[PDB]
UniProtKB/Swiss-Prot annotation, chain D:
The chain holds residues 1290 to 1547 of 4485 of the full protein. Dynein heavy chains probably consist of an N-terminal stem (which binds cargo and interacts with other dynein components), and the head or motor domain. The motor contains six tandemly-linked AAA domains in the head, which form a ring. A stalk-like structure (formed by two of the coiled coil domains) protrudes between AAA 4 and AAA 5 and terminates in a microtubule-binding site. A seventh domain may also contribute to this ring; it is not clear whether the N-terminus or the C-terminus forms this extra domain. The lineage of its organism: Eukaryota, Viridiplantae, Chlorophyta, core chlorophytes, Chlorophyceae. This is Dynein gamma chain, flagellar outer arm. It is found in: Cell projection, Cilium, Flagellum; Cytoplasm, Cytoskeleton, Flagellum axoneme. Consists of at least 3 heavy chains (alpha, beta and gamma), 2 intermediate chains and 8 light chains. It comes from Chlamydomonas reinhardtii (Chlamydomonas smithii). Belongs to the dynein heavy chain family.
Amino acid sequence: ASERFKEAFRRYNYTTPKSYLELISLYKMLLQLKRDDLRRSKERLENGIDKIAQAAAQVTDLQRVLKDRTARKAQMAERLINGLSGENTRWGAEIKRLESLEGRLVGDVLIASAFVSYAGPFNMQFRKSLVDEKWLPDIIERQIPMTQGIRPLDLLTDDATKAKWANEGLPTDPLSVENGAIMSNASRWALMIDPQLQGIKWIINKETNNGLVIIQQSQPKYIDQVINCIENGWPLLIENLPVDIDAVLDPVIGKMTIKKGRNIIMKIGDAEVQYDSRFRLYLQTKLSNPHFKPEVAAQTTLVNFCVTEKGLEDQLLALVVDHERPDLQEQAAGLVRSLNEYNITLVELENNLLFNLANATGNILENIELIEGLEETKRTAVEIEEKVKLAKQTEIQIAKAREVYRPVATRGSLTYFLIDNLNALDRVYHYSMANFVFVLKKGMDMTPGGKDESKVPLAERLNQEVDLDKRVELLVETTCFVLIGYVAQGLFERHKLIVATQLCMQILRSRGELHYAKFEYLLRGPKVMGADNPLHDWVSDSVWGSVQALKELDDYQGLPEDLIGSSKRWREWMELERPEDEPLPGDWKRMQEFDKLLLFRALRPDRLTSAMGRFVTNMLGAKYVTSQPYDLERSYQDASPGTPIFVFLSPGVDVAGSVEALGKKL
Amino acid sequence: KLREYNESNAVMDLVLFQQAMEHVTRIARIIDLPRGNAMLVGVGGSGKQ
Amino acid sequence: NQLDKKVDKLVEGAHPDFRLFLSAEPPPSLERGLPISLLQNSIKLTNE
Amino acid sequence: YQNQSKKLPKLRDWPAYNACRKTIDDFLEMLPLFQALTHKSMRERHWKEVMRVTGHELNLAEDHFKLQHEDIEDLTGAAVKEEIIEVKLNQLKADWATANLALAEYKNRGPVILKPSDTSELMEKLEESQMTLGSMATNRYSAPFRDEVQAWSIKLSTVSEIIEQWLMVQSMWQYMEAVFSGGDIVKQLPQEAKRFLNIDKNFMKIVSNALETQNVINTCFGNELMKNMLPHLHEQLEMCQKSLSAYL
């Protein structure tokens, strides 16, 4: 896996014994802990069994002795015995759950151990391919007892726990929740490759009030505040440790060498005298691609958090879903974190009936607090029953809405990934991902076709169709439209068509592709040695070679046939004639139906540029390179103060007086 | 005498697997050599120490 | 950094009638200049 | 049946004889239950049947006979139709998992080229099955299977069209191969002859991505045949032959 990864993605993993020993450590941890947990669960029902048995024996003694007052005695006896049964039922039932889990423990914890131990350094695809297609099959082969509908993601954390986590800023893709469970059970705590702040977000919203000592490797006091967190258990936050190479932290935080690992420490201690670490460290690497030595990487762990296409798609898809389906969202959110008291109520009223039993200790038809404590304990079962199924159907609606907005959100996400990589060119375009998503909310939310507001400076909006399908196929466009608009607010008309060209290219690459044959032609220079076949005002001598090269293309090889055929018009064309609506007559452009790009690339530059403009406007409306109206109020006070107002200045223009009047206008 | 190198310099642990002892025996040959540079070429983090 | 480091909280705590206005000629786009985080989070304008 | 078989010779007063009528009442609706427990009906459809036949006594996943035993017959008919379309899709998916190729070696250098196979078999096995798919689309009971039909139908159509375009490429590539086999075929336009090497290499790569891809669907979907180099080689085929005729 490391091999085909590294020779797929330049990021480098180095294996060691200490990893295999680490897996031993982690598995032994989890197995023994879960065994203790199930143990400390089991006692409850067990104990009450004995008193139930004794009380039932005593009442049966009553009836065997019996062979009007007796009738009422009997009625209390009936309700009592039925209640005692109905209680001890779920008692033994839960205990047998506990032992079934006990049986599955070995294999299930094996899968979870391997999963959460080494799934971190690889992509979702590698993670799935490794686990579900090698080791789960291998656990089928050797057949260690384990349940096969296994999600080890739901083996370090719970939907309530993850619900808080996402509420504390954990992103919604499987990647983020997986990594969150990972650091919730990390033991060499993994280096968190987060060049987008989102892991830092979940940490700071979730893991700060303990006293989050955030600090970087820039001082010798850094060791001393490590001792402070040792003496204080503080979460020390590292920000991009791999900005250097340093040689003191490995004893400090490395958990140096493992054989079977039953011996990890996470906090303050008593026999600890070296004072290396007595606190649970946090790290945040803002570098997307670190590198470390095989020795160096050997002593600590690593986990992915670089935003990808699907991850960003999922975050923003969740945003649009709960933005347009907030109701089932809040139903789910309330129930998932109210189930705690729902369960506590029934188990504790059961406990009250149990202590009513503890007060019996010698009377049954006379310790009648049992009947009272029995009835409510009975119908406290009703509380939890409908919650689970409503949760499941709500999750069904969530998956439904996920896929419904998946095309729309995927197009918008695509366009984001575009502008992300487009930021490689610098000052013509630099916005924040926050500013981005704000434009996104502008496109989905203030979408006067998402609402009924026809009284807007947005008539492209439906303005009358709040209906959700019109909203689908409107807001899908409104997002990307306001995107390219406010992007253009910092763009030059010199490059807006550059933007348009690759926008159309990547849109078709989403819904197909222009092949590396066609597209690599479109890039690499269009010329081979000249062809004397074009003669000679048909085609220029350099264009002779251009045509000759283009006569190899399966979409373009038929060219000299066309030359000999309509020699008249092709002589006409490259004799510097410029029709532009139908520059060349579409006869060959239906004899080719070419990809809108490659023909003039061999032939005609000016009509090529006009054709790029026309084609883009066909896809994207006429408004692409059409310049920005130099606003004063809206595109500035539509946004927040927290996004300050700045301007790029062309030579010989000032908005300072315009800023003043703008003030005086408002 | 496992404890005796389990009480030795900063370990880069490998407890007994066959190949390890075969390497160790090669070196135990090699150590009795002037300039006895047994250059244990391999990956760090594994067993050399 | 000596103004934006303040911005990152102050304009987020700013009284909601605060309109701060900045203006700069952009130097050459790879010659020595301005960090990105400056205009990642500010409103912009082109002029011709 | 054994229980009833001995009530046949007995006959006395009707208030006693009521057991005969109730016993025979059991059988008449037993056969719909016979079909209902034939696993061919998937239990969600049977679950709706429970919702309809007032068999709510079986809302539990456990269906004991005290709970197990007009509207029943028609729903069992729909379950039978379920079974029928299940059968219709079974051999299709199985046999098209068993898709396989046939590559007759060409004379020089023995490259195994697909010409016992691009015979009408690999197209018509797709096409008659596609008419079957269209029929079950017009059969009211492929409704779940309709989307398997969509995915398959698209795969089959693509594969057939790929076979067609590939065989045209192969045919004219053979012709130029049978023209540019070597030697004096190069003494006038090495321009054309230089591409012959790499395009023969391309034919070899296709021979490969048919050899390892021993499923017709996944040969057409095979490596680099989900890559439209076939049009490029097709243009190479068409371009050189007209110049050859010109020199002729």
